[PDB]
Amino acid sequence: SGFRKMAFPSGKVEGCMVQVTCGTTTLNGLWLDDVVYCPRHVICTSEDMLNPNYEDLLIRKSNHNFLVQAGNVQLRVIGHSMQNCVLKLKVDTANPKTPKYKFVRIQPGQTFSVLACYNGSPSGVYQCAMRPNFTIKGSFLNGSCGSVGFNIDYDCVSFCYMHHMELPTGVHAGTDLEGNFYGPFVDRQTAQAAGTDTTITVNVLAWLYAAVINGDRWFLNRFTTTLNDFNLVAMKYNYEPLTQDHVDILGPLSAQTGIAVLDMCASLKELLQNGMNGRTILGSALLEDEFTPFDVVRQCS
Amino acid sequence: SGFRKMAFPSGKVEGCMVQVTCGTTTLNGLWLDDVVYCPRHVICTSEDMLNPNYEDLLIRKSNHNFLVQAGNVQLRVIGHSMQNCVLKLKVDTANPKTPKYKFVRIQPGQTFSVLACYNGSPSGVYQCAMRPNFTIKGSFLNGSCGSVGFNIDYDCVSFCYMHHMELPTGVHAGTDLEGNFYGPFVDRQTAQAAGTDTTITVNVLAWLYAAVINGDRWFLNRFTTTLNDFNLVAMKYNYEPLTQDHVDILGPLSAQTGIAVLDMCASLKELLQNGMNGRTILGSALLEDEFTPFDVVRQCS
Ligand SMILES: *[C@H](O)[C@H](C[C@@H]1CCNC1=O)NC(=O)[C@H](CC1CCCCC1)NC(=O)OCc1ccccc1
Ligand SMILES: *[C@H](O)[C@H](C[C@@H]1CCNC1=O)NC(=O)[C@H](CC1CCCCC1)NC(=O)OCc1ccccc1
Predict the structure, then answer these.
(1) At what angle do helices A227-236 and A261-274 cross, to 10 degrees?
(2) Are the beta carbons of B299 and A139 separated by less than 8 Å?
(3) Count of H helices and E strands in chain A?
(4) Which residue numbers delimit the Peptidase C30 domain (chains A, B)?
């Protein structure tokens, strides 16, 4: 028993992290087979990053402008190219630690593990959710760019996030591994800000099911609402509408606890209106929305 | 910026996890050089574990009663022995992934990362504190025994916890890697319960410093208390007394924020007496005590 915020074991991804240096800038790259993936803003000069033209900047580079270090051994770049906001560096050595992997673009509300790295060296691992406003609430310092987020599915590593920048509110923005930003953000230093967030309803409900599986029942009641009357409550408290798809995704947890989804919704409704009154749920005094139904199943059985 | 509950990267420890089978019981072992470490209760029968005599049980075993699998390749045991509550299995193959490592017995209040495993295979990683009552609030299912807790210090893995059992309140108890239980617990199925806990004061204060470094200042005030008058408040709210040693450990964080420890204590005092009034600190609506001063420094610079 017990319920903790859990990341995937990071070993398979640790073997892929390298350091990429271009001129004065250093950040992390992902070394998969004979290609290194990293943010394209590594080729930005400190002056020409208010509005850079990346196709010109890259045409003016050559393979010897890029220094790649796997551990201590230097990697020689034999080709370079750009795909959206990621730079791709062909190296002469295939990574012998390359796992089975996929590139996946995730939906808001999904979670992943982040392996924060500095200078090619993994520093720590933690779990993150893609917020509805396409930011993540990470923990990233200077030099963390190129750190990746990932999920694991029977030794296949699904990479889904590469880190590029911090927004003014302290939250973070980046791309999928094919270089497309999540959300409306762009890789130039301008006035882009995170939009207003909403709470991921299906995750809050999954977390309430984890609380039930772990013995916290004080918030249950006998009431049952309908979908339509619940979503009116969600709108008032800035929660994502509950869809039929979400109800069905919650099925296994509903079956394991014997509490129907719409029964669990009438408990959430009471919590939103009356608060917790000094009680906690799974060690928290607020409603938590960064556990997917999948995360709950994986940890509660 | 940002502050997240962060585990150490688990790769160095993943390469050490094996599966140990004795009769009908299966749990995880730690394969370091040519020795496998696991809980000694793996040799317990389901009937003779209300009060077992482990020296007799082990005398009645032979090397072929133990099955060790590293991945898929079976390991042959060429020796066995017992040290306190851990079993040690000599195998004929040294682990070629053996990192630089130490065995360390930690103090309450210290944190470590837990690599939860089932059947020798790492499942997830999370951070834990040794509570003052020598339990940990983990997340462990059947078959998790032998999962280890560890810290990393420049590629030297310091193992400090091996998992043995769940207590009635859902918290967890285990040993150091030399087989000595943390706390008063013993490895037989009896009526042992966790004692009353206390909050780790020095950690709460480190977490308040992390909040300041990250822009949460609404709880600061101009008051400054003394050590003696603070510890009277700690006693009333079930907090560990603040020692002079703790004050000095908080020095670097005090220096980085320019807020003296005894200044930060007068903010904690106000929070304990008046609560948060619907505000949060680093995304939490209660005071958090599972970040050491070291964890804060490592993540805030
Ligand atoms: C890459 O390593 C950093 C990571 C940032 C710095 C602190 N926390 C992070 O997540 N990325 C950058 O510094 C960005 C570089 C720009 C990105 C757009 C194209 C040109 C280059 N800038 C950035 O994140 O700006 C905000 C910021 C906040 C706090 C400290 C520094 C910068
Ligand atoms: C080993 O893999 C398990 C891990 C436990 C089970 C669920 N969560 C855990 O942390 N350990 C055990 O099952 C213990 C075995 C005993 C330990 C004392 C010596 C004889 C063998 N027992 C145990 O933890 O009992 C409590 C319990 C709670 C919930 C489910 C099962 C057991």
Answers:
(1) 30
(2) yes
(3) 8, 13
(4) 1-301
* Cβ–Cβ contact A137 with B under 8 A: yes
CATH number at residue B289: 1.10.1840.10
Q: Does A3 touch chain B (CB under 8 A)?
A: yes
Q: How far is the CA of A142 from the centre of ligand 1 (A)?
A: 7
Which chain B positions have a beta carbon within 8 Å of A215's beta carbon? 170
Q: Which residues are CB-contacts of A172 (< 8 A; sequence separation ≥ 6)?
A: A135, A136, A137, A138, A140, A163, A165, A166, B2
Q: Give chain B's radius of gyration (CA, Å).
A: 22
How long a stretch of residues is chain B? 301
Residues 6+ apart with CB under 8 A from A72: none
Question: Which residue range is the domain that position A226 belongs to?
Answer: 201-300
No. of H helices and E strands in chain B?
A: 8, 13
Chain B residues near residue A140 by CB distance under 8 angstroms: 1-2
Burial of A96 from C-beta contacts in 10 A (0-12 / 13-18 / 19+): exposed
- The C-alpha atoms of residue B262 and residue B247 are separated, in whole angstroms, by 8
Contact A131, A125 (CB under 8 A): no
Residues A183/A173, Cβ–Cβ less than 8 Å: yes
Q: What is the DSSP string of B242-275?
A: PPHHHHHHTHHHHHHHT--HHHHHHHHHHHHHH-
Residue pointed to by tokens 């669990």: A264
Please pick, among A41, A80, A164, A172, the residue that the annotation labels catalytic.
A41
> Which one, of B49, B32, B23, B56, lies nearest residue B188 by Cα?
B49
Print burial letters for B102-115: b (CB count within 10 Å at least 16), e (below 16): eebebebbbbbbbb
Of B15, B139, B299, the CB nearest to A6: B139
Experimental method: X-ray
Smallest CA-to-CA distance from A238 within A205, A201, A283 is with: A201
Q: How far apart are CA A248 and CA B258, in angstroms?
A: 52
Nearest by CB to residue B2, choosing from A1, A10, A139, is: A139
Token reading at A214:
């772990």
Question: With breaks defined as C to next N over 2.5 Å, after which residues does chain A break?
Answer: none
Distance separating alpha carbons of residues B139 and A6, to the nearest angstrom: 9
Residue B7 to residue A7, Cβ atoms within 8 A? yes
**Is residue B256 less than 8 Å (CB to CB) from chain A?**
no
- Choose the catalytic residue: B41, B164, B172, B246: B41
CA distance B200 to A277: 24
Cα–Cα distance measured from residue B295 to residue B149, given in angstroms and rounded to the nearest whole number: 15
Q: Is residue A23 classed as helix, strand or coil in its secondary structure?
A: coil
Give the C-alpha separation, B205 to B296, whole Å: 10
Residues 6+ apart with CB under 8 A from B35: B88, B89, B90, B91
Greatest CA separation for chain B:
69
Q: Which residues from chain B sit within 8 angstroms of residue A14, using beta carbons? A: 9, 11
For residue A210, CA distances in Å to A218, A257, B204 come to: 13, 9, 26
Q: Which residue has the tokens 């003014």?
A: A168
